Design brief:
The protein is globular, with a radius of gyration of 16 Å. It has one domain: Thaumatin. With 207 residues, it is mainly beta. A hairpin with a 5-residue loop joins strand 5 and strand 6. The protein contains four helices and twelve strands, in the order E-E-E-E-E-E-E-E-E-E-H-H-H-H-E-E. It is 11% helix and 36% strand. The strands form two sheets. Strands 2, 3, 5, 6, 7, 8 and 11 form a seven-stranded antiparallel sheet that branches. A five-stranded mixed sheet has the order 4-1-12-9-10, with no helix packed on it. Taste-modifying protein; intensely sweet-tasting. It is 100000 times sweeter than sucrose on a molar basis. Pfam families: Thaumatin. One of its GO terms (cellular component) is cytoplasmic vesicle. This is Thaumatin I. It comes from Thaumatococcus daniellii.
Length: 207
């Protein structure tokens, strides 16, 4: 499956793509304002994620650091990134279908649209200004808006026991971005697509 990843932000981002224990394609790349990077993801990829990293410095060997989304200091990511990170999430070819969603469960850093480029389903979008409206106790000094689990580490926020409900913090994400997961047991906003669909992930989809 192809994913075109497009940076429409006015700033540079470093795109990242991973399934948790391995890179997807090259795993990571700089995208200046306006650039596009097309990657190929193996069919049957389960639990893949794509995200943006901000304010990064890499040396010539591709080691360094990012203020948001850092995946162990590597340009070419092999594992998931450090919150806060808006996430495009997908599982491909799962009994005939593809499954996509956007999640705020690990916070928000960059607005995003995640849309198929082939027929037969809708896209999802989380483009509101969550960073600027963030509640004081969630603001990440390094940039972005943390989820409550990352800040407070309690069973209720992390949904450790499988029994959590909505909270004042998860309701902030849900009010700004109704179409993204705001906590673990949120009412699903996953979109079912035809198996083997192709996709575009756009950072900063709106003006």
């Amino acid at each position: 499956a192809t994913f075109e990843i497009v940076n429409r932000c006015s700033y540079t981002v470093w795109a990242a793509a991973s399934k948790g224990d391995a890179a997807l394609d090259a795993g990571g790349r700089q995208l200046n304002s306006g650039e596009s990077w097309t990657i190929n993801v193996e069919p049957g990829t389960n639990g893949g994620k794509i995200w943006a990293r901000t304010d990064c410095y890499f040396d010539d060997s591709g080691s360094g650091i990012c203020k948001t989304g850092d995946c162990g200091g590597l340009l070419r990511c092999k594992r998931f990134g450090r919150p806060p990170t808006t996430l495009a999430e997908f599982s491909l070819n799962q009994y005939g279908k593809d499954y996509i969603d956007i999640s705020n469960i690990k916070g928000f850093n960059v607005p995003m649209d995640f849309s198929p480029t082939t027929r037969g389903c809708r896209g999802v979008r989380c483009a509101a200004d969550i960073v600027g409206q963030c509640p004081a106790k969630l603001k990440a000094p390094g940039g972005g808006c943390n989820d409550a689990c990352t800040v407070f580490q309690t069973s209720e926020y992390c949904c450790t026991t499988g029994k959590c409900g909505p909270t004042e913090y998860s309701r902030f994400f849900k009010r700004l971005c109704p179409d993204a997961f705001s906590y673990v047991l949120d009412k699903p906003t996953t979109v079912t697509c035809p198996g083997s669909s192709n996709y575009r992930v756009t950072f900063c989809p709106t003006a």
